[PDB]
């Protein structure tokens, strides 16, 4: 006989899981155990927040769920932020979580728990299989709910007993949730029509604009026309080091952006991938005085700033190469070609340097310098995840990983640790502050254990500035964002990983270029100077 | 100057609402108060019960919401079958109930809930909008939620306070929830080959398949080849009395129908439209020696017995002509001509009639009475076994049936409203004995509204589906008898005409004076039902 | 051999559950089978709707859950409403429904549901079993959730397969839910004092204060002290004819009545078995600086305007009593004689048409303290709350909780099912008479002695005087007419109608002799009902 747990790893193996990550636990070690002989590598992990963090790193990177796996109860609810981070940011995931047996469903047992329950609000889909002739059907399902368009966590909770009885149905195979045809003909040629006509037409591209296939696709479109493009945050790396004219910008958390004035004189907007989750619709678009075009996977939710005079919905990369020959050949306005390059020259201007602290600005200058395309790089929440979404330059698709979802803390190391293996042979950089690297730094023993060639930066100012920052522009005074210091060398080295000290900026080219050679982790601590950090809150009118 | 109330009837104006059906309350009453000055006309109902089976009947014969309208507590949980029908039938509709005001919420007071929890289970979209200006967004949203592929039910809660709360917003203009592309032209030709190479292929159209556009694509089809189509009770109206050659009956609950033999000696069956509600695939596709290709417009869900090779996601109307260019002109293989052939012989013989009225001469009586301009409506329950499978329907959305949940009562409130979206026209309903009871209070809203309605109920005084069902299993009924309730009375009570068949040469003649009747009309129709247990034989 | 179905009937026996109100489906059935053979006895109901409201009647009447049985999906769903009316009005039901098997929990197929996260917003207890043995734990535990107090619903999902599944454990033995002591004796002569001193004290009793131990104790502390109360509309049937003195009315839904100025008057406020659902706070204690004693078998929550100095928390019976011992012989103040005694001249001051108040006394003068009355929600409600006197505990039910429309007639089924050999009085309004009408038939087939008025105006009242209140207007009140006489021929009841003054008790008294059902038409005068939310305080 062969055992639900069994059919849990058949099924993972089905879907081509390379790895798991994963901490044991009573009520699901049955799956472990089937792990040992067969099926994914297993990445035991030093809390499951993480092992969320990465399975959602794995989706991001790959476009196929990453997969946790943890025990009943505390393991359960540990995912809890991993799995709301995956949905909100289209990361797939998979999470696998045991629970307590049938008969002791509705018991006060150890680790009983609602886990359908507590993860309906922060997944696509969160269900209990409770026959475990169904496993191989609802683990199919849950993947496929991942990978669908809006990509997300699937959370599935196994009974302790189901995973422990017997059951002779197969898994079922690997059944790929497939792609779609491009937006009707008809309104493809509507919104080109549109675009000719438009004065100043804008890209706006989002986090679904960012998929090697759209990315490529979209290029294509660039090289064919004189459009300009504006980013979100996690569209990073969509255009080229070729198509670099195009580029205007990363808009983010505040309207101060050349980006901003940029869709603000926009008469016509065609949004690729647009998520309002990373950037307000009425931030941008307050007056509705532009046509706004949505291309996107799905259709889009109405804001009073956001209603879509056309949709073409479908795949992306379909819609648009269907656009670009439509599109190929046009031109711009001579006043837009001014107004364009005008603002070229305010971008290339505030990407300029301005003490034994490094400025944030040297920092991304002195690492953009230093590393190739084929590096990723992956970054924390704060005031330092404002300075790389805005200067840090990436030019080639996912090679710099925000979470502009959430914007949960402790995400830039495990998703450095998943980084790494998917993409093996590669350097990966994590940048992170002095708070939030905290929330993950345990896992800095799970990189030290599978010497993953990793540099994580440690922005040092010695508070939560992002929140102090932002404190002190609405009430000029911050509260509860002070904390003491932690030596973050000494705190590598206790995990065995390497740890460097930038103590001048005379010094910060080199201690890099000796963290990218050093073989294994790697952990340097930049004291960072956050004196204009107020500035990125500052109005433009 | 204006409040959220205000806004809603706005956004309701927006959506171009024609009708609203509800019951007004203490938390609510500030819409019913927009609505007295300007915006869709309100139909009173007598159970928040009807007005989401009326909804959902707007949703099904328009593609676009229907809107009911209750108050809080009471008023809203009226609605959860309503929405539970309406989600798993693919129907479009939006509830709007009141809530007690902010401040009272987590508070003990007069019908106090927690509407959105509530509703989560049962929708595709249940929200409570807390701050008035929000209402236009939520509303429009809540619409396309509605119409999104994969149609259903989006509730919206609506606080007491929010409604008399000013506000400034303007309501947002029509905003249509858009449709795909066809699915991507490499994965329609696979399919075509697919089925050109197949010894038999079988089309199985499902509840998506019986819609306007998708049907004209469907039919457009069959005029170019030689293929057969089984369809799913809600599939009804697909195949034209011309192109009645290609069609092979409808599989149902029980795996003992010509269509079903049909699925199982396909080696290629091409689904459109299919959602598994209607027909679990354990029960066609056990074995697994089939192609199973999935054209429909959202993903497919992963049963053991249900593995698509391919998938054409995306527009069904679409994809369906697109594919019929790459068919066109396909013919059958003379061993499968004679297997059809041989099936239509089957097909015709159980649709054949033997002071008790047969279920069968009930429906030849009234389809050869009904022209393809009259919606007919049926309730569940052992009458709607015989009308799935033996009452055709020649024209999209002319047999509505509810096959997702299986929910008692619809059919006269369905009729209510395929009356009001389909003016000028009569609408026949069929229900039993059991079921008319759980919605006949709505007999005062038809005679209310006049609504040319004839309602038959097939009497025989139990609730046979279960019973027969109980019978097999366990060799005895239990629960199933009820006394019985005169049902011509009953329709004179509200002025209703009420007309009894006792006997089946009465039938005929009854049929044709109620039909010639203006205003609602019921008829009592003495059935029988010795023949019912063989719905359910193991015939395969 | 066993299966959970026989499982679910071996539990149900347990409980003593005399009667079950079911509608059976595919996925329930086995129980229906089970349920052919022994054990409860099954009321087959004409909707889900009124099972759930007979299950609740049965709590209310007899403190023991009401128990209801249907099917997945539409069975199921049907519920709804049902159970939440009864965790709102602290009415013990327990109900069952069938779900898919548990290989088709996650599949998109016939009546599919999520059962229990449906019901979680609505009882006191939502769950669904996945193992045949812990049948009879669920089940003992949603019983003893629904006696619970702050008693209300508890629902139990049942998957078709489980119910199919052998099983050789033993049901569980009548568990019953217990009993607490009185509040801490510090606690009560700490009241005890408060009142003594206070110079008017008044009691509110609630819908915890009108069960039958509840009541006796109340009646024995009112033997002895010389205190005044007032009722919520569920507190009916507390005070009885010897002890009429201390009554001053029913607070209701507008604060305009004798009961309510007593109310602010009052130094001291003692309520017992209070819940809010019933009166907001902010109605009553809204303006003034009264001490608050929350006296309740659950402690209180807190609103801006209801925050009790002390709470005596435990058996309402066991407090009372004790309390009773502590305050036995205290009189009131002179100035509290005179108010008292002026606003009890204040309460007894309260066309072809029918007035409200006509119908309120012929009927009262027509039936006894043995008689069951339940009450529809509508303006009707509000006349019968506030006029229609009750003297013995829960011989009229109100809906005050949910206010939902229907609930009379499939409670005065469950009354009769409950109380045989005594009438019941049912009464109900044009509309939400055809929210429950159905179960006329039910009530044919059991002979129930029950006679039920439909007070016929046009429209929804209560919503339309509210309405004009609020925007001068009425909107979607208006219905079309339903022949009542005819109606109920049509189920085999007998159908009366009152077509003068003249003629009301007669008819009333003809359908009380009358052996089974009868439903009288009531045409009723609706002039007066603006003026129940006039101000006068
Ligand atoms: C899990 C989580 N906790 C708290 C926050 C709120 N938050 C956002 S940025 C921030 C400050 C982070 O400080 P640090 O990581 O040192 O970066 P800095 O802003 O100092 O550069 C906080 C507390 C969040 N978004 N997620
Ligand atoms: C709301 C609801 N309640 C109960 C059921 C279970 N059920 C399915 S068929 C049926 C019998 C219907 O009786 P009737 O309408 O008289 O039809 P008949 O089977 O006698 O033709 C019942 C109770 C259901 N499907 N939906
Ligand atoms: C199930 C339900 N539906 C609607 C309401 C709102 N409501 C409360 S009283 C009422 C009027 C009922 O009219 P009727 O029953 O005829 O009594 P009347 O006020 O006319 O005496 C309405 C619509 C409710 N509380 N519960
Ligand atoms: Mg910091
Ligand atoms: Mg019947
Ligand atoms: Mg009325």
Request: with cysteine; charged share 25%.
């Amino acid at each position: 006989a062969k055992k639900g747990a069994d059919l849990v790893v058949d099924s993972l193996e089905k879907q081509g899981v390379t790895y798991v990550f994963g901490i044991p636990g009573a009520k699901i070690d049955a799956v472990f155990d089937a792990l040992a002989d067969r099926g994914p590598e297993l990445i035991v992990c030093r809390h499951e927040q993480n092992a969320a963090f990465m399975a959602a790193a794995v989706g991001r990177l790959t476009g196929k769920p990453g997969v946790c796996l943890v025990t009943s109860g505390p393991g359960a609810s540990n995912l809890a932020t991993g799995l709301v981070t995956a949905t909100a940011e289209g990361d797939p995931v998979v999470a696998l979580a045991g629970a307590v047996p049938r008969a002791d469903r509705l018991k006060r047992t150890h680790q009983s728990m609602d886990n359908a329950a507590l993860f309906k609000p922060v997944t696509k889909y969160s269900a209990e299989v409770e026959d475990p002739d169904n496993i191989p059907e609802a683990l199919t399902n849950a993947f496929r709910a991942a990978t669908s368009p809006r990509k997300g966590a699937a959370f599935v909770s196994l009974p302790q007993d189901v995973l422990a009885a017997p059951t002779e149905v197969k898994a079922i195979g690997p059944l790929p949730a497939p792609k779609l045809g491009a937006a009707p003909a008809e309104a493809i040629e509507e919104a080109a029509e549109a675009i000719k006509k438009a004065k100043l037409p804008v890209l706006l591209l989002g986090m679904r604009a960012s998929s090697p296939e759209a990315v490529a696709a979209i290029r294509e479109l660039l090289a064919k026309t004189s459009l300009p493009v504006v980013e979100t945050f996690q569209a990073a790396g969509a255009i080229s080091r070729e198509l670099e004219d195009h580029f205007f910008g990363r808009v983010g958390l505040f309207r101060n952006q050349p980006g901003d004035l940029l869709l603000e004189k926009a008469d016509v907007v065609l949004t690729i991938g647009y998520d309002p989750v990373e950037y307000d619709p009425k931030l941008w678009n307050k007056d509705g005085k532009r046509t706004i075009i949505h291309l996107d996977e799905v259709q889009a939710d109405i804001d009073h700033d956001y209603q879509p005079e056309l949709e073409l919905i479908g795949d992306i990369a379909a819609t648009v190469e269907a656009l670009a020959e439509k599109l190929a050949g046009l031109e711009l306005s001579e006043e837009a070609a001014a107004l364009l390059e005008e603002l070229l020259a305010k971008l290339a201007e505030a990407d300029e340097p301005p003490s034994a602290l490094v400025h944030p600005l040297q920092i991304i200058h002195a690492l953009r310098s230093l590393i190739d395309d084929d590096v990723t790089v992956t970054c924390d929440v704060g005031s330092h995840y404002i300075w790389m979404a805005r200067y840090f330059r990436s030019y080639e698709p996912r090679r710099l990983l925000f979470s502009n979802g959430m914007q949960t803390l402790g995400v830039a190391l495990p998703w450095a640790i998943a980084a790494a293996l998917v993409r093996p042979g590669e350097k990966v950089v994590s940048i992170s502050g002095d708070g939030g690297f905290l929330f993950s730094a345990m896992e800095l023993e799970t990189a030290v254990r599978l010497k993953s060639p990793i540099v994580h930066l440690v922005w040092n100012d010695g508070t939560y500035d992002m929140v102090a920052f932002q404190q002190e522009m609405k009430y000029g005074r911050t509260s509860g964002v002070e904390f003491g210091d932690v030596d973050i060398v000494k705190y590598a080295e206790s995990f065995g990983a390497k740890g460097l000290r930038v103590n001048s900026p005379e010094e910060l080219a080199p201690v890099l270029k000796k963290a990218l050679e050093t073989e294994g982790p790697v952990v340097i601590d930049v004291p960072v100077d956050y004196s204009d950090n107020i500035k990125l809150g500052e109005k433009l009118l």
